Amino acid sequence: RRRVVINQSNQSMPVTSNGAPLQ
Amino acid sequence: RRRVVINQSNQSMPVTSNGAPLQ
Amino acid sequence: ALTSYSRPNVNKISRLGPDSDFLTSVVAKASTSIVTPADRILVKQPLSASSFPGTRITGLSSYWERYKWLSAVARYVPAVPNTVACQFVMYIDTDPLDDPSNISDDNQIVRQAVSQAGSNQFNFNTSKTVPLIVRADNQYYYTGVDKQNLRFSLQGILYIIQVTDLINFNGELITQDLTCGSLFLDWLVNFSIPQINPTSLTDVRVDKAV
Amino acid sequence: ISRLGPDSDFLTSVVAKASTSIVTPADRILVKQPLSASSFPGTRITGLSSYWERYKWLSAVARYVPAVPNTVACQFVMYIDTDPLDDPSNISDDNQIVRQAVSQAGSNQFNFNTSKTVPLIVRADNQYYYTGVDKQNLRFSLQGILYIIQVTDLINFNGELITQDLTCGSLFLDWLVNFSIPQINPTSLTDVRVDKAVNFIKPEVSGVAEIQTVTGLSPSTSYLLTPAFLEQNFQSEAGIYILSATPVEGEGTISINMDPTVTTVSGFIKVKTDTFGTFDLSVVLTTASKKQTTGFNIIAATS
Amino acid sequence: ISRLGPDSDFLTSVVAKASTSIVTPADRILVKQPLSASSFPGTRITGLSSYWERYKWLSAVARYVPAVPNTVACQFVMYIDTDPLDDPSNISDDNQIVRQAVSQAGSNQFNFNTSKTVPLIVRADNQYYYTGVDKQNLRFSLQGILYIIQVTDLINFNGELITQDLTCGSLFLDWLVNFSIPQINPTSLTDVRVDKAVNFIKPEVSGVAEIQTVTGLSPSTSYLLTPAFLEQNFQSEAGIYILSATPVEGEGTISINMDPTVTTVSGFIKVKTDTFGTFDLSVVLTTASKKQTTGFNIIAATS
Amino acid sequence: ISRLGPDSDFLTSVVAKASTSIVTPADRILVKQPLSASSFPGTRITGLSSYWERYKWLSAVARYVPAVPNTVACQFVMYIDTDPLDDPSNISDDNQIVRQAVSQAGSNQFNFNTSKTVPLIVRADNQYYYTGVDKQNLRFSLQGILYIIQVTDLINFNGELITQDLTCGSLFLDWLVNFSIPQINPTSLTDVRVDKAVNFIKPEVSGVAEIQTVTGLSPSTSYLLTPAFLEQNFQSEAGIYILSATPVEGEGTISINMDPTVTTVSGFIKVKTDTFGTFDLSVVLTTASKKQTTGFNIIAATS
Amino acid sequence: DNQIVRQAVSQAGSNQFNFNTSKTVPLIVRADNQYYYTGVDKQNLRFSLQGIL
Amino acid sequence: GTRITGLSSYWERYKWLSAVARYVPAVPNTVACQFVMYIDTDPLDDPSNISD
Amino acid sequence: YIIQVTDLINFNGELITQDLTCGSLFLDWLVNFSIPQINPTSLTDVRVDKAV
Ligand SMILES: [Ca+2]
Ligand SMILES: [Ca+2]
Ligand SMILES: [Ca+2]
Ligand SMILES: [Ca+2]
Ligand SMILES: [Ca+2]
Ligand SMILES: [Ca+2]
Ligand SMILES: [Ca+2]
Ligand SMILES: [Ca+2]
Ligand SMILES: [Ca+2]
Ligand SMILES: [Ca+2]
Ligand SMILES: [Ca+2]
């Protein structure tokens, strides 16, 4: 047989964006 | 916070017993 | 353009198990080889999660910070017939710095073993189990290789003590040191705070020129 | 009211005896083990027993395991005599001593190749028994006496009788006690033992103390040091063998004065090891040319 | 049970380093700041930490601000190692030390032109850590170690590398603690400093004490006074430079005896200022014609 | 607000004085101890007082224990004057100064070989007195002043007058506070003190740096080193006594240059110890044949 | 000599007495639940001692 | 150094189902250079021996 | 791969004269893993292979 276990040994890293004006 | 993920990155090893007679 | 990659504040506790692993073999010995009482110690196995190199649990242990054995029962399997006989006593001492190896009495080392909680006494041609006794309080232990103190990173030490001369079918003494069986663990852990654990990195370098 | 247990404690190792070692019917009693709590020195139940006056076993099931192959054969009968004064040793018939065994309630017979147990029969009333060593009457301090009677000649696989006294198993106790009246019980239930013997070093300079560091002992335990020397010709050359040993930590002076006018072989050193199982003491000789070895004995309490 | 917070405390100023100052991969660790409460001397959390034994951060989010223009560029990664003994300093590859960073949970990377934070990951159990200086094992007294790793060469607006070690921001802590067991922690976590040096006055009359009033110091704090003089030819004329300085309030005698037969440059004055930051002391010279200047150092504890 | 307590502290010792030392009724005031939070340097309430703006004693009871045998007798009265500018130090009648004492609320009257307590009576309104060291008006930052008036001459076992003043007991404050508005509250109260005065080593070969390890100090605490000497002839033979001490880890120099053309005694060292309370520094002499001893003070913040 | 006794009286549960008077001193327990180990001393002295008198 | 390389040697084989690599700059809008970023699927195609 | 196609220019349109680190690379991944095995090269072990 083969089985597909959803492994739960990870962790996320969400990306946020911004940006400064000249003044 | 703390969370408890059931990690599914293992595998079993079941133990069976027997034993031979003298004859 | 400002960008960031902040990981969240969560602590995932990954409960692995139950799986089974191999610890070591065990070498019973003759009465000729037993001189000091500390010769009767057959195995001295640390039971950290990072203490069995080769198993996957030691591989995976250095990718979290701490562990705790929830269920840990070590299951002795013999490899010998019913024609040779010697009596073992198997236990898991919970203090990793209590060492029986500096006891000058041969009867005291085997009363050291049977009086530990969870010990199981057996003829070594019979398969028996020994359960780990968990602490009353909730203590975690650091993974990885051992630092300054064993009491931060070892939850127990498996011992097997020999209490009787290794006898044969004819009631005579065996004259050789004889390997006799194996030890398998049946475990169940938590793991908290994933970290790469910098001693796990394979790297060849020269430390110090002395 | 201080209820402790259930636990496990190793009583003794049982030694089955050969056919030539059995002469009288009294010689079939392999073990005669009193089941007072203060009667298994070194174990956990006896160490606890010296810190209360009274006790009572709620459940004392004695668990025997074999240490012998299944290819040899002998047969045991095993019981717990609730009266500590009923002595089966004066029975002149060989079969009557084993009918004495199976008639006692709670008894058990077994082949000695397997693991069987004997429970302790409770009393009808509520009587507590005393701990400590047995002072005057055994009926105050002993709840039972465990017996194991050999009923069969010890055979081997080869169809022969074993000619040697053979250790054939072990006795373990699964115990559950009450206690009362916390105290100390003035007689100590421990035994001392000469741990090891190692000689004094030979200092090179006369009248200057060089420090002898000894290793290999147990960490952070107290020891006692008494001198002992065997077959040394101190008059093989000139001079007088005068030794003085003092610890840098403990208390005491070992003095060896082999002047045949005034002989003084006396003194004792009380010192405890460090965290590494080592200690050190100041060894000095008045005549350093006299290289006759002198030893000392390391006394320690084992249990 | 003594819960205090939430507040704010300045840890350190972070100094980004030039490209020539980066040689080994260990040299990318800008700050290695232990996050024990007793590890930020002078701040409010460390002053409080010396008055309880144990603590535990309930929320220790470390808030970085920039002190740099938006026209220069570099990139940081920042984390809190919960194990205080996992040391990233022995990693011989330059990319492996920053993969060590982002793999730790609760980590964060950012451009150093903006304000980002790193929270402290709580344990799974309830363990308290000790305050005070780190005695033997770091795993008892440190909850985390804050790291900041430089992953990028420090560029400027003009497309060039900065050649100087540049202070690039500040680290603040938003903390919330428990405590227990009120006490004092015998090692003082303060540092002393020579506050200023000012010379003794030159009295006009031999053997008559004129009082020197000094100003400019902090009000109502205790100071320590020790003499220090540099390159004075006392034998340029006749006489012996003998000084005696005593406070009119405190305790101590500074004595300067430049007689080359018996030299005595010794003593110390403990005195505290008034409400106006001034104090005064009796300066007297045996030979007032000797106008060689002699100074003293004002010692004070700053934090 | 932060409500800390209840806890204990140490105020002072109290020295009861004899008949001859009491000449005016103003001499009967044994202690004039302000019971502000910020007036007991080194204690626990004073160290906490510099981390908040304002305090208020909820329950602050001062306790007295005797350090005196039961064969001397002297009646005390003890009160906490809530007005800090009411001053009993200028009352001409010896009975009026004790009627002024016993009429204060919460005062207590005891023989001085008997342990008793005195409670501070709180205000009817809700005033938060300021923390920190004193300023212009003394009614903003003090909640009370503790006084102990000696009301009877000190006596012996036989009823005759004691002729010497006697330190007799100690005062302990059992307190409970509110605090508000965390500040770091400048002009800190940590007084510095000479820890010990230890002298340099006398090396053999001139122009060589050697390591002098000084032991027995506090572990991991920062110190301050100032040079000193006492009564030395630096011209006893040929050569100019030049010394230079530099640490191997710390910062600064010490210079002992007794050149009669330019004499320099200056410099200081800030160095901290290891975990063993030890440190080391590099001593060099230009003429090591000249064995004039030279010291150095060790300045340390005591609390 | 005064700082060593201010360090003493500020400990929780300390007691101040003339030495011809019987008194008591209570040990203040931890806020968490730590079980210190029994037996003789080892490497670290914070694993097996709850207090020093 | 990453946990994925640590955990990769506790299984035999892998396959990237989703793999998107996300370039983050650390530079202002005042310097300029043009990159091109790709993931070649053949690990033996090497552009390092191109003379143009 | 990351290929550079243009000269590294500044704000003034002039060439940068230094080699300049410029940013980072993060992966956003999703894998399978089949057949758990300890993978014998993962074992940390110090030994001498071959004397040449
Ligand atoms: Ca143990
Ligand atoms: Ca670790
Ligand atoms: Ca008794
Ligand atoms: Ca009977
Ligand atoms: Ca008794
Ligand atoms: Ca402490
Ligand atoms: Ca770590
Ligand atoms: Ca303390
Ligand atoms: Ca203020
Ligand atoms: Ca132990
Ligand atoms: Ca390709």
Residue numbers in the entry:
A (entry chain C), B (entry chain C): 31 to 53
C (entry chain C): 54 to 263
D (entry chain B), E (entry chain B), F (entry chain A): 66 to 368
G (entry chain A): 159 to 211
H (entry chain C): 107 to 158
I (entry chain C): 212 to 263
Copy text from the publication:
A major factor that limits the expansion of shrimp cultures is, however, infectious diseases from viruses, such as P. vannamei nodavirus (PvNV) and M. rosenbergii nodavirus (MrNV), which have inflicted heavy economic losses. The Nodaviridae genome comprises two single-stranded positive-sense RNA that encode the capsid protein for viral capsid assembly, the RNA polymerase for RNA replication, and the B2 protein for host RNA interference suppressor. While the shell domains (S-domains) of PvNV and MrNV contain conserved sequences of 62% identity, the protrusion domains (P-domains) and N-arms show low sequence identities of only 17% and 43%, respectively.
The structure of a virion-sized T = 3 PvNV-LP was determined by cryo-EM at 3.5 Å resolution. The cryo-EM map clearly shows T = 3 icosahedral symmetries with 90 spikes, composed of 180 copies of the 37-kDa full-length capsid proteins in total, distributed along the icosahedral 2-fold (I2) axes and the quasi 2-fold (Q2) axes on the surface. The icosahedral asymmetric unit (iASU) within the T = 3 PvNV-LP contains three capsid proteins occupying inequivalent sites with somewhat different conformations, which will be henceforth referred to as A–C subunits. The cryo-EM map allowed modeling of residues 64−368 for subunits A and B, and residues 31−368 for subunit C. Thus, the T = 3 shell exists as slightly different dimeric capsomeres consisting of an asymmetric A/B and a symmetric C/C dimers with the bent and flat conformations, respectively. In the T = 3 PvNV-LP, the ordered linkers from the C/C dimer exhibit a parallel structure at the opposite side, whereas the linkers from the A/B dimer adopt another new structural feature with a cross conformation. Remarkably, one iASU of the T = 3 PvNV-LP contains three sets of two Ca2+ ions, located at the interfaces between subunit pairs, which are coordinated with side chains of Asp146, Asp148 and Asp151 that form a 146DxDxxD151 motif at the E–F loop, Glu118 at the C–D loop, and Asn250 beside the linker from the neighboring subunit. Furthermore, residues 47–55 of the N-arms from subunits C5, C6, and C8 are engaged with hydrogen bonds to form a β-annulus structure around the I3 axis. Our cryo-EM map of the recombinant T = 3 PvNV-LP contain some information about the icosahedral-averaged endogenous RNA structure.
